[PDB]
Amino acid sequence: ASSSFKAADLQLEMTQKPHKKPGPGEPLVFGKTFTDHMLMVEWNDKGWGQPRIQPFQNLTLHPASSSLHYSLQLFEGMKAFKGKDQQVRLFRPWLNMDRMLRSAMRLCLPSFDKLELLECIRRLIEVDKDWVPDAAGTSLYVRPVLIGNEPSLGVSQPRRALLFVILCPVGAYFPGGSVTPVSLLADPAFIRAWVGGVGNYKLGGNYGPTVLVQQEALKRGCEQVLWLYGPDHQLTEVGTMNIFVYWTHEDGVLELVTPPLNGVILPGVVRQSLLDMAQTWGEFRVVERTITMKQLLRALEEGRVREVFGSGTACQVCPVHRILYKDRNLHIPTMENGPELILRFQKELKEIQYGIRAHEWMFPV
Template sequence: MPPAPASMYGLCSLGTRWPSLGVAQPTRALLFVILCPVGAYFPGGSVTPVSLLADPTFIRAWVGGVGNYKLGGNYGPTVLVQQEARKQGCEQVLWLYGPDHQLTEVGTMNIFVYWTHEDGAEPWWEWLVTPPLNGVILPGVVRQSLLDLAQTWGEFRVAERTITMKQLLRALEEGRVREVFGSGTACQVCPVHRILYKDKNLHIPTMENGPELILRFQKELKEIQVSCRQPGNGPGASLIPRSPSLLAVWEVDYISREPLGHSSVGTWPGTPQGLLGVVEQLPPHRCLRCSAVRNQSPRVDVPGVMLQAVLHIHRPVASHHASTGLPTNDSPEVQY
């Protein structure tokens, strides 16, 4: 692994090895993985804003097609448009779709808009919006991570809905746009400061607003990546609660997912008494089921190797709460 702040980028590729000149379903394929040490995706680092070319003349994907899959056929036609964007002083292309010029995604990123709602009567004044998964955009992992994190915070409205250029233009004119940014595996969270649309340069006040939300997302993602901490809601249930909370732990067979004999309860940053020793002795097919009981976080089955690394990193102080009346192995708390 390269030293921080660089990282290792993994790229999986699947291609056919079927010896045929015809067009048909292949019977053989080659799967290979490329690992490469990388630094910042864009020159200047992760907080350097980029500019986007939004030209409705070009279409990347359409409903009923394969735009939501990472296929080579989706990227080949974009190379020429990317070159045109660079000629016009833009780093990337913001792909539009439909007669109303819907924002879909950037060349290597999903797109987010953080703005204030046009209706002051709305219970949530601030909104974080990203285009929906309608078959036109890729369901990015970082995209979902940002949605999960924002929903966990509960500080503003989070929505997946259509955004048109007309809506964005109006919001810019009314001073309601706070930040626009892209998200992706390579770039993580990347601010946008300019959009070239119909020969007009639209200034996006992302950097004038901090960019507070972007920096917060970057900090949270980095903490998760380097400390094995997982976000608090959604598919990645919280393994390490943000505040001390009761933590119930069961040893679980990784294949059958059936609870086994070990059950222990403790608090975080304290842990169940003797838990570290139990984790170190877990065989490969075992994992631990963790449930943060007090804050009602979802349960998560964690492979012993991962939990062992987390416990070593945080060096918790043992704390046992046998008389708290928390769930036992027979409790519904351990059921899915």
């Protein structure tokens, strides 16, 4: 693509009524509390306007905005971590920028310079540094969004777009820093994405249809959805997380496996990070390969499965203890195996994310 929008931006406008911050231990359900400022950048015929940090405020959109009629919208999700020493760091933000730009191109939305956006986010997080908690397992969620915005009903490439970023302080995913497993509903009737589709982009359209399915999972007594694909019932991803299986494969070899990027699953940043980390250790086979329900079943009977977990920004490494498939509950022995791999992954990530050990994956303040 081409380039635009930069570092030196159309200033800062600070809030006149800084909101009261969550209180120790009680507060924040995820995504309900927002900080004082936000980033906004407009794009049109004149190209990109100047970036701006402004008080958190509502958006003003023409009723025919393509963002609301034809889902010309994409978003990202990443976290900034504060380790007392009060230093704040973003976890591998570049991968989120790479992903956002790919999503933008898929929807014919305007390209932007990945590094300028990162610096702009850096400046915003800076203004709201104090919203960044520091208690154990807490963080600041960063939500960048790009939407089409042509006041036209034709389905077409917008000639106007808006980019914005808001922040949410977040509690520790696991109550008081424990770790609890989830149960998953695995029903083939449900299909999140298709080959040749857009499941590998973080487009809002991928999410809206899952609301009803997640409701079913709850009614069937499960907490999240394990999305299956194909006549083969391949495991693809779980909820808003990639899925991993640690077991002794059929050839007698102990491995950490996860579905490959074939176009149906989202290239998760945590997923890539767990692959990287495990390969680096070099203690067992690490591979990206298709996993089927049929293989999972035979593995569980022979006692070859050690741990199964989801990976994502919300819950970096999430153990799974049960899967309800075809009306029959499969017990997943994850917790009775430690869960050793999961705990090491969490510790390594904690040490890296909270600055206790230097690492190129972290981006300062």
